[PDB]
A paper describes a structure:
Truncation of the first 182 residues of VAT removes the regulatory NTD, producing a construct (ΔN-VAT) that has both higher ATPase and unfoldase activity than the intact protein.
Similarly, ΔN-VAT with bound ATPγS forms a mixture of fibrils as well as single particles, the majority of which appeared to be six-fold symmetric (red circles). Single particle cryo-EM analysis was performed, excluding the fibrils by inspecting micrographs after automatic particle selection and manually deselecting particle images that were part of a filament. This process allowed calculation of a cryo-EM map of the six-fold symmetric stacked-ring conformation of VAT at 3.9 Å resolution. First, removal of the NTDs in ΔN-VAT makes the complex more structurally homogeneous and allowed specimens to be prepared with thinner ice than could be used with full length VAT. In the structure, a central pore runs along the six-fold symmetry axis of the complex through the center of the stacked NBD1 and NBD2 rings (left, hexagon). In the six-fold symmetric VAT structure, pore loop 1 of NBD1, containing conserved and essential tyrosine residues (Tyr264 and Tyr265), forms an opening that is ~28 Å across while pore loop 2 of NBD1 (residues 299 to 305) forms a slightly tighter aperture that is ~18 Å across (left). Similar apertures are produced by the corresponding pore loop 1 of NBD2 (containing conserved residues Trp 541 and Val 542) and pore loop 2 of NBD2 (residues 575–579) (left).
Numbering used by the authors:
A (entry chain A), B (entry chain C): 183 to 726
The structure:
């Protein structure tokens, strides 16, 4: 096969891939670079990534990069052969490296040499562990030998291998970026046939990933397979005549971009349970009213990250974040995404149901992992929704998960975040009081920004922005409903415009421009979720 | 390699290193010192330290210290070789020592000979255990043989090895001191090239560690590696032309001190979860008002530790400590650090969220470990913040962690501390009543010092101290806001001066001197967190 694993295969790993390649090649082409400054390159390296992220693929490309002799050793077969000859085999590879040195010691998907740090007492497991530690020991500075590895679990590997002088440098490659997803799906398109250069399809492939925040590379490379198999069904019967494929019609059946759109289903993506990063596309234009908060909230979040220097000339402490509180449906979930979306900085999404929900929850650490993933990805703004559920007051809930896993965990995490650090915490919840008052302590959350319900005058703006996609009638006027009622939120009016469609649809089977009457009947169909009684609740709850 | 492991490599271990060296060398150069007085030096010794603290390194230096024949035996490879030949190998080393005696029996990172005290029943594990106990047994008084070892877990080693006559003396080296951190980072600078003697950089290196309380030595030695790798990236492309390094530009690329500042990130320090020691730099000048409390609190803490003798001439019992209670934001967290910071005595920091939070919390022992780390490090003052969370009243919380791990544990710990002992307990919490009244029993906490909210007259001082770093306007006067409102704490005014910057920034894009109006608009932006209603709460809560 003239075509072999090369860089162009990998995609979206450019920063990580670049660093790994640089370490190997700079050390590999010649030691003189590291030989002169700093220690020789660390022999062992661990590539920690979610499964099916391409780690296995990375090593081959690395091997082709400097031309060093390729070797690949796998945990599944490391101990494959019968016990007592396993150890001999492990030693043999190390012996093998010097002959072709400079060479690359290559093994992947290794849970076998270190099945568990302290849990497994098996001798076959133990013997290999020992030899490995020693081979690491048997490795010498002169040798152009590089050791590599990947694993599903970061800490699943032995802790001891962690001390430096063995596995000193580790780089973990995560899910590919939205633009990175294209590279993966783009390359496989080469074999994939579309009939034309189809830069639009390329642009189509661009959006193909955008249909979801992202997935694992492996599954993505499998997604393209779905289209082939699936799309092949339509043209498959015509060939049932005989076994040999007719040359009359040969490769004139091409997978249509719609095939993928039909292929995305049934492929059961989202095999990754790891913390994810997502950037929403919402824009302030989608935000009606609230000119004051947006203008101030923006300068609050944007200033520290975008203009840190000008913020230091004053000297006041930078903000660790702020919390949002108001009537349900004021758009908290929508606002945060806006500021986060507007800012280039990476975004992170946290859900109160999901935090208990996302993992076993036996350990609420996921949250402690959030900042770690957030800190590394900084500058970024972390978002926590329904922080109350996540951090209910301590007395109310008799559970380990509520207090032990998170509320206690939460105070510690906030201190860790730093102003220089590009991390920022934006909370939103229905009832501020429900959450532990401990979070309102000075320095944990600087200010509490209340979101007032949409004003009738603001209603005039809130309505157009949402119905812009909706076809409207020439006679129907939006401001009418605004002047009618002062009690409706944005969330209720959300469904309000929603129900209007049903009303307009109910009269006429085929869709037509909505009518003012279509709002009135629906206007009384859903009453305001916010009365003058609750407004006082927050007005008083604004102090605590 | 002419350069080999020597004392100068180690740093910050001077007391511990000195003691170990003395034990080996005094015994090693000649027995006559110990031979005449006291028993011969204990053959076995265990060096207990957090991982990556340099323990491994210590043995080599010790070996070079008296010139005794070096031998190093490691747990990873102790049992490395196939079972049934492992035991023979262990015996062989002991046999080996006499030939070159005086010699040093040297093995490190040993969990293998004693994988677990009672948990592991493996024969290979057991056989070695037995031989080890016996070799300890086979060791004889005449022999100039010294046995050493390190482990992550102190009690992880077998309990039996603990009885004297085997492993009698143990010294554990912890995290290096702030000044000690310099030694580590300083020595590696030798290979590290800066272009000049750069005593400033040395002073720069001085502060390099001060950016954080501290870390593990190993990681620190790795930190310098980050700069090399990271800093090498800027000058790395220019060499892409060919593999051989051009002699035209040779070592004219030097790591800049800013590189480290850029290197500190991404290095994921703080791999140590052990109890830590930190000394804050706060000074009373940073403390506005409260002339009475500081003057009295100082004489309360300082007197016993600094002037114990003059305190004994009276004869009254010394103080085990005292508790602080007052409105949130009165500066409790700030005051304690001040007195602790002012005093040379080492400081310890305890957080209520963190204590549940810091470890699994299944065992609240960490706290019992606190004093142990505190007692050994005395004279020092232990600090517990939000003692309520840590020690809520027993009836309110239905949890094992709250009562079993700590409140019950707490009473026992206090008795252990002694007046001669330089340990002192300074508590602070929002609500004294919330904590178990059991802590107010006589002798546990002598007095309860209430911190009154900042007085308007004191406000005049509180404001300047905080804004000293802030550029101010010639017309703007500080006392104005003081005479306006009697209800603001220090913590709220904290943000108050904070929000002022935003106000001043909001008008003018580039930062300029603040204006009186900038305070007024913000003055009403945040109302006092303490009204005349809460003051009565503490006024009455002052009795219990
Ligand atoms: N960024 C990427 N670039 C190219 N291929 C990728 C990428 N990520 C995943 N893959 C795909 O993964 C498949 C090979 O298996 P994979 O890469 O999953 O092994 P690995 O990720 O190294 O180890 P594991 O399979 O255990 O995760 C290839 O078909 C390859 O196209
Ligand atoms: N300023 C606004 N501009 C446009 N739409 C808004 C605005 N505020 C709220 N909405 C509407 O509210 C709907 C959902 O908001 P949501 O209820 O998620 O906010 P929230 O109630 O603060 O968050 P949560 O529901 O998680 O408590 C959106 O569909 C949006 O149309
Ligand atoms: N105080 C110190 N002085 C000099 N080097 C140190 C110190 N603390 C840690 N190190 C570094 O540790 C590295 C060697 O490994 P290390 O010292 O961590 O082994 P160990 O601490 O004896 O055992 P473990 O690695 O299991 O903790 C060396 O690069 C050394 O510079
Ligand atoms: N005497 C003082 N001088 C200067 N600043 C003070 C003083 N008292 C309080 N402060 C201000 O209070 C802020 C934080 O104090 P903090 O709220 O931590 O004290 P506390 O409320 O007693 O402790 P905790 O918040 O843990 O209950 C500091 O930034 C400081 O500026």
């Amino acid at each position: 096969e003239v075509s072999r694993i090369s860089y162009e295969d990998i995609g979206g790993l450019s920063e990580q891939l670049g660093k790994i390649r640089e370490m190997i090649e700079l050390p590999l082409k010649h030691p003189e670079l590291f030989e002169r400054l700093g220690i020789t390159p660390p022999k062992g390296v661990i590539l920690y990534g979610p499964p099916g992220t391409g780690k296995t693929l990375i090593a081959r490309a690395v091997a082709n990069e400097s031309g060093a002799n390729f070797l690949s050793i796998n945990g599944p077969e490391i101990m494959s052969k019968y016990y007592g000859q396993s150890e001999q085999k492990l030693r043999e590879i190390f012996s093998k490296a010097e002959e072709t040195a400079p060479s690359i010691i290559f093994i992947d998907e290794i849970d076998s040499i270190a099945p568990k740090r302290e849990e497994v007492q098996g001798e076959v497991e133990r013997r290999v562990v020992a030899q490995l530690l020693t081979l690491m020991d048997g490795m010498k500075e002169r040798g152009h030998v590089i050791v590599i590895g990947a694993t599903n679990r970061i800490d699943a590997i032995d802790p001891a291998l962690r001390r430096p002088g063995r596995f000193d440098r580790e780089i973990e490659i995560g899910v590919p970026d939205r633009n990175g997803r294209k590279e993966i799906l783009m390359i496989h398109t080469r074999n994939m046939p579309l009939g034309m250069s189809e830069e639009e399809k390329n642009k189509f492939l661009e959006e193909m990933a955008d249909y979801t925040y992202g997935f694992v590379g492996a599954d993505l490379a499998a997604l393209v397979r779905e289209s082939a198999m699936n799309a092949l069904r339509r043209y498959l019967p015509e060939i049932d005549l005989d076994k040999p494929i007719p040359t009359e019609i040969l490769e004139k059946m091409v997978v249509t971009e719609d095939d993928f759109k039909n292929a995305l289903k049934s492929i059961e993506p989202s095999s990754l349970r790891e913390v994810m990063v997502e950037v929403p596309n919402v824009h302030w234009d989608d935000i009606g009213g609230l000119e004051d908060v947006k203008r101030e909230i923006k300068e609050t979040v944007e200033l520290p990250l975008l203009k840190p220097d000008v913020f230091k000339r004053l000297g006041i402490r930078p903000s660790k974040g702020f919390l949002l509180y108001g009537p349900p449906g004021v758009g908290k979930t929508l606002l945060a995404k806006a500021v986060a979306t507007e800012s280039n900085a990476n975004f992170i999404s946290i859900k109160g149901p999901e935090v208990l929900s996302k993992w076993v929850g036996e350990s609420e650490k996921a949250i402690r992992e959030i900042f770690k993933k957030a800190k590394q990805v900084a500058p970024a703004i972390v978002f926590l929704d329904e922080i109350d559920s996540i951090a209910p007051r301590r007395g109310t809930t008799s559970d380990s998960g509520v207090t032990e896993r998170i509320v206690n965990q939460l105070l510690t995490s906030l201190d860790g975040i730093e102003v220089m650090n590009g991390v920022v915490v934006i909370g939103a919840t229905n009832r501020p009081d429900i959450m532990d008052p401990a979070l309102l302590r000075a320095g944990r959350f600087d200010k509490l920004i209340y979101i007032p319900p949409p004003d009738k005058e603001a209603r005039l703006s809130i309505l157009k922005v949402h119905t812009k996609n909706m076809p409207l009638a020439p006679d129907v006027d939006l401001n009418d409903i605004a002047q009618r009622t002062e009690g409706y939120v944005g969330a209720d009016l959300e469904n309000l415009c929603r129900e209007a469609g049903m009303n307009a649809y109910r009269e006429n089977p085929d869709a037509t421009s909505v009518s003012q009457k279509n709002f009135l009947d629906a206007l009384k169909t859903i009453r305001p979720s916010v009365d003058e009684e609750v407004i006082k609740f927050y007005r008083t709850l604004s102090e605590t």
